[PDB]
């Protein structure tokens, strides 16, 4: 049994929600709040420890765009701050390679970034590492044998179907095929040796259609969409299959958590979250 | 097109819906503002919505009270508007809000609608408030923020009783549609908005806004009369 975890996200006002889903008995478990609320934020896992980056506080009594990174000890159920990014990044993307935190794009007020920049827990030490070509906020970020995903997202002016990857040894970002589909806040992952962007935006619409990218071929193909259309999703890859959290659908903040089986390219409905949330920071174990 | 309705006249302590009907594009193909005009005043930021991930902005003045939304199926927005006071009394407006290099700007208006009700904030100051001119005239308005905001400004013409224009974002960009005797330009916390050559139908109230920092603010406008 490993956990889906879900941290933050919005309903009324950015959440301060950490919950755990066990796909094995469909039950959520209830553990400590994150100090601070945030919607926008990603999740990533390091060596056991899960860490919720970025985002912004949209409060009643303010919203304020977030540096932080805090780090939560499933063990100890305790949350600890980290040092804090060179920048805020609302909308934030985030991958992990050589178990570093990588923190891509995302924005701070109307500053929509392209830098990119990675944290080595060792030392708890942020260092800018290339930037990518495309200022990209709601960007979808995964990771596949070392090589860092970008997908889409917004650059300020246009909601985006271009894609790029990060080479870690040579530190360079390059272009790779675009979407069949604009696509601003999908869910990015990796399961099979592709790349899947799901949902999003694409300017006129919330998007239920799902899209995936075989680095073999350098191609773009759509598989089964979701039920639901929605974008802020929050995403994550358990056991062989793609799971969906929440979202926005244009009328209201779902609830809803669907699953992708890549053998029968079908969705079906799992136990849904305690509360509907956009914007959430998932990871899993 | 936007077509408000849902105001009228009521009590403090009232509850009123506006409602902002979309034709001829989808409600959810933008941001959504609501902006207020208080009789013979300023201009005030109401509230948003982000239809990519749903979350709503409000004014300090309204928090809490007000509730802004989007109805996919049915193409029209509300603002839920829950104990109401005097001070709300304003013309009220909806807008669909067009990004603009990381900054938000509102292209197209509502018509508006009456509601009768019976500080830290980035000033926007614009001087003259009133500007006596004649047709030929090469006329220079003026608009000083409190503090830097970059390049987030834009400037609106009015008319009286109809909604703001989106003339320049960016501090200097054009919109479509506005004829190229109007431009704009910045020198630092100063903007100005420049017509080259005052046309008959160039009589206006002329506005502007700041969408740099929460909340974004108007200037009080100058009135260019004949």
């Known amino acids: 049994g490993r956990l889906i975890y879900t941290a933050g996200g919005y309903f009324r006002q950015s959440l301060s929600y950490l919950e755990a889903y066990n796909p094995s008995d469909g039950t959520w478990l209830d553990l400590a709040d994150l100090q601070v609320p945030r919607s926008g934020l990603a999740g990533c896992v390091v060596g056991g420890l899960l860490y919720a980056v970025g985002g912004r506080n949209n409060s009643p009594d303010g919203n304020t765009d977030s540096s932080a990174l805090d780090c939560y000890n499933p063990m100890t159920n305790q949350w600890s701050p980290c040092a804090p990014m060179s920048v805020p990044r609302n909308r934030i993307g985030v991958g992990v390679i050589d178990g570093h935190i990588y923190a891509v794009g995302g924005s701070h007020g109307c500053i929509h970034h392209n830098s990119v920049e990675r944290y080595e827990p060792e030392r708890d030490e942020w260092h800018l590492v290339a930037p990518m070509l495309t200022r990209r906020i709601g960007v979808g970020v995964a990771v596949l044998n070392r090589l860092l995903y970008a997908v889409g997202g917004f650059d300020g002016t246009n909601r985006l179907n271009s894609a790029e990857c990060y080479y870690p040894e040579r530190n360079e970002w390059r272009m790779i095929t675009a979407m069949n589909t604009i696509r601003s806040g999908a869910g990015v992952c990796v399961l099979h040796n592709c790349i899947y962007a799901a949902g999003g935006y694409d300017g006129q619409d919330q998007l239920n259609s799902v899209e995936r990218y075989d680095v073999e071929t350098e191609t773009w193909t759509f598989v089964a969409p979701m039920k639901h259309r929605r974008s802020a999703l929050g995403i994550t890859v358990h056991q062989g299959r793609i799971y969906v959290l929440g979202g926005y659908d244009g009328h209201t903040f779902l609830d809803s958590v669907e699953c992708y089986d890549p053998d029968t390219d079908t969705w079906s409905e799992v136990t849904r979250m305690t509360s509907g949330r956009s914007g959430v920071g998932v990871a899993v174990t | 097109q936007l077509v408000e309705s849902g105001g009228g006249l009521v009590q403090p302590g009232g509850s009123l819906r506006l409602s902002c009907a979309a034709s001829?594009?989808?409600?959810?193909?933008?941001?959504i503002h609501w902006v207020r005009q208080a009789p013979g005043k300023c201009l005030e930021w109401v509230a948003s919505i982000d239809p990519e991930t749903g979350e709503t902005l409000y004014a300090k003045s309204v928090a809490g009270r007000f509730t802004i939304s989007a109805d996919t199926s049915k193409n029209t927005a509300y603002l839920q508007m829950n104990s109401l006071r005097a001070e709300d009394t304003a013309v009220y407006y909806c807008?669909?809000?067009?990004?603009?290099?990381?900054?938000?700007?509102?292209?197209?208006w509502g018509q508006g609608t009456l509601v009768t009700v019976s500080g830290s904030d980035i000033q926007m100051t614009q001087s003259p408030s009133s500007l006596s001119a004649s047709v030929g005239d090469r006329v220079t308005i003026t608009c000083r923020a409190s503090?830097?905001?970059?390049?987030?400004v834009a400037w609106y013409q009015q008319k009286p009783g109809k909604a703001p224009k989106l003339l320049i974002y960016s501090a200097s960009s054009l919109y479509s549609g506005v004829p190229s005797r109007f431009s704009g330009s910045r020198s630092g916390t100063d903007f100005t908005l420049t017509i080259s050559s005052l046309q008959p139908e160039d009589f206006a109230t002329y506005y502007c806004?700041?969408?740099?920092?929460?909340?974004?603010?108007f200037g009080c406008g100058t009135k260019v009369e004949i």
């Open positions: 001829g594009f989808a409600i959810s193909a933008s941001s």
């Open positions: 806004q700041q969408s740099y920092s929460f909340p974004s603010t």
């Open positions: 503090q830097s905001v970059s390049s987030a």
């Open positions: 807008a669909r809000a067009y990004a603009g290099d990381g900054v938000y700007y509102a292209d197209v």
